[PDB]
Design a protein around this nucleic acid. Sequence first.
RNA 1: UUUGGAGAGUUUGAUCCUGGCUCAGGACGAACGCUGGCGGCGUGCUUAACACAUGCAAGUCGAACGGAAAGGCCCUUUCGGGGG
Length: 180
Amino acid sequence: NYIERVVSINRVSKVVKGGRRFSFTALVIVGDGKGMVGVGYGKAKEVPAAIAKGVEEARKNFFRVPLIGSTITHPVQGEAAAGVVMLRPASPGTGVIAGGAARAVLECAGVHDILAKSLGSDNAINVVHATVAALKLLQRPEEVAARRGLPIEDVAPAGMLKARRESEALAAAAAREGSA
RNA sequence: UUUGGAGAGUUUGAUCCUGGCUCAGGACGAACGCUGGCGGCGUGCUUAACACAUGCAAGUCGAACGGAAAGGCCCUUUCGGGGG
Ligand SMILES: [Mg+2]
Ligand SMILES: [Mg+2]
Ligand SMILES: [Mg+2]
Ligand SMILES: [Mg+2]
Ligand SMILES: [Mg+2]
Ligand SMILES: [Mg+2]
Ligand SMILES: [Mg+2]
Ligand SMILES: [Mg+2]
Ligand SMILES: [Mg+2]
Ligand SMILES: [Mg+2]
Ligand SMILES: [Mg+2]
Ligand SMILES: [Mg+2]
């Protein structure tokens, strides 16, 4: 099961000797719900073809973002493209709060508690570029410890240690429920 | 070791940036238009620190003192009232 959300259908026109030629380009994000993000932006001659190309591009370009429980690990300064976006993991039930493209990508990724705030040049394409860059700029505590040659207890705080333990127990319970 | 960030529209043939304007919310000691049933609970001259008809919004102590205008009492009465 995958998710596709229409974010921005746009009209473009090109000029040659006879006059103006109109055109379409669209952007769409695809995700599985466990932390897999896929974006695709393409041009076409009409909405259905545009969406088809967008879905193809999204499938081709994927990414995996390790999540903790049901929220991001630490706050992310998403600097790229032309906009500036900042993110902050949240407590549960609060939800994932951001602007349009931010919410598109995040709900595609499957998160349910996060805070974001676009900080200039909100054009949807650049915003999504920045979100993807920030999301790939995340760090996994286990790999951080592995790189630093330091162990999990000493590297990671007890709070997120217990959070990860509870998430693991919940995942085991869900797997048992599914198998049974 | 715990609480908590929304953008959208508008330049161009078409984008991107910057930048300007406008809107989606809460709040009023608020006023006007329409509507209108009760009860509960607060609130109520922000401008003219403008002049202000009337009355209310500062009184208590004879066991501090002299006295008795009006009343209570008794001696009196011509019923004017006279003593304490
Ligand atoms: Mg910088
Ligand atoms: Mg560059
Ligand atoms: Mg900007
Ligand atoms: Mg903007
Ligand atoms: Mg709070
Ligand atoms: Mg315009
Ligand atoms: Mg312009
Ligand atoms: Mg134009
Ligand atoms: Mg009325
Ligand atoms: Mg009432
Ligand atoms: Mg009242
Ligand atoms: Mg006195």
